[PDB]
């Protein structure tokens, strides 16, 4: 019956090594509802929601040959909340890594993904409260217990990727999570701007043309 307030926090650029990391953090009384990342060239290893000093933080990983990455936290005032992270490691021999909120009453607010390999491989091409990532990547689900909290998924896909793809939440909903659907080649990153989910792409033409899809997690109370 309350209002859900969310804001975007960008970390400082990480630096150019494989071990160079970027951390985006929320204020002590805010909740980290999602974690995304951005790199001007691509050449990234995704991101993960990690526990640091009792609170959850958004950590971004750089790839070998990458100039650095930005960690992008979505920070929200969610009253009476209990948020946890559920991780599924990669299954390289599968059609994609899957994870969902295990506790009854748990609501999915965001999906993060990170990989250990230098870049993501090729393959032959969602459920309630479920995150789906690349077969070679670890998938991280942000799962929250909050009274009256309801979340829904909205998608927008364009064949010609260009500069960006956007998907916006409807009026009355708050954008809590922003990401790109997996298998979409040439993704620079994703980030929330108000109630709009922005997915940036490297504009590389088709080589079966594909569709770069912006995936939004929209939440409300009551």
């Amino acid at each position: 019956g309350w209002q859900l307030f969310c804001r975007t926090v960008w970390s400082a650029h990480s630096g150019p090594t494989r071990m160079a990391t970027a951390v985006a953090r929320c204020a002590p009384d805010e909740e980290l509802l999602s974690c995304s990342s951005f790199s001007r060239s691509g050449k990234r290893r995704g991101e993960r929601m990690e526990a640091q000093g009792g609170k959850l933080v958004c950590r971004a990983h750089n790839a070998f040959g990458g100039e650095g990455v930005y960690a992008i936290a979505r920070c929200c005032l969610l009253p009476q909340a209990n948020c946890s992270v559920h991780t599924a490691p990669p299954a390289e021999a599968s059609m994609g890594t899957r994870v969902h909120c295990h506790q009854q009453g748990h609501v999915l607010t965001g999906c993060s993904s990170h990989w250990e390999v230098e870049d993501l491989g090729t393959h032959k091409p969602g459920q309630p409260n479920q995150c789906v990532g690349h077969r070679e990547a670890s998938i991280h689900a942000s799962c929250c217990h909050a009274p009256g909290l309801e979340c829904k998924v909205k998608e927008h896909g364009i064949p010609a990727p260009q500069e960006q793809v956007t998907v916006a939440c409807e009026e009355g909903w708050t954008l809590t999570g922003c990401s790109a659907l997996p298998g979409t080649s040439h993704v620079l990153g994703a980030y929330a701007v108000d109630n709009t989910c922005v997915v940036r792409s490297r504009d590389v033409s088709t080589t079966s043309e594909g569709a770069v899809t912006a995936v939004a997690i929209c939440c409300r109370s009551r």
Partner: nanobody
Amino acid sequence: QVKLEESGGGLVQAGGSLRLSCSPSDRTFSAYAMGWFRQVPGREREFVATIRDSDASIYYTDSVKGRFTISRDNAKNTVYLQMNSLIPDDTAVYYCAARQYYSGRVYSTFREEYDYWGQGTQVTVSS
């Protein structure tokens, strides 16, 4: 009825320093909290810094910690944003924000938490 007036900004080179100032037209208006937000085009107005009445009330976004300093002068009724070792990523339109009344939160970090805003001052950090 209160309009916040911003001073400073413009072009400055990487590694350089700049001081932004902000004061209301009516100097008898004392805000409980003063803040700085910045907007990169295509992105939301993001939180930079906040201050109330003490050093314990000061809070910065991680990306500006150790480089930027927020201070308040009651006698001049002005809030300052001293920006040192400026990096190309500091390029944005910087906005002053004022929250008139008390907040139960230790730090006011959301746009929605503020009432009055500055016009916005462009900061461009060369090469």
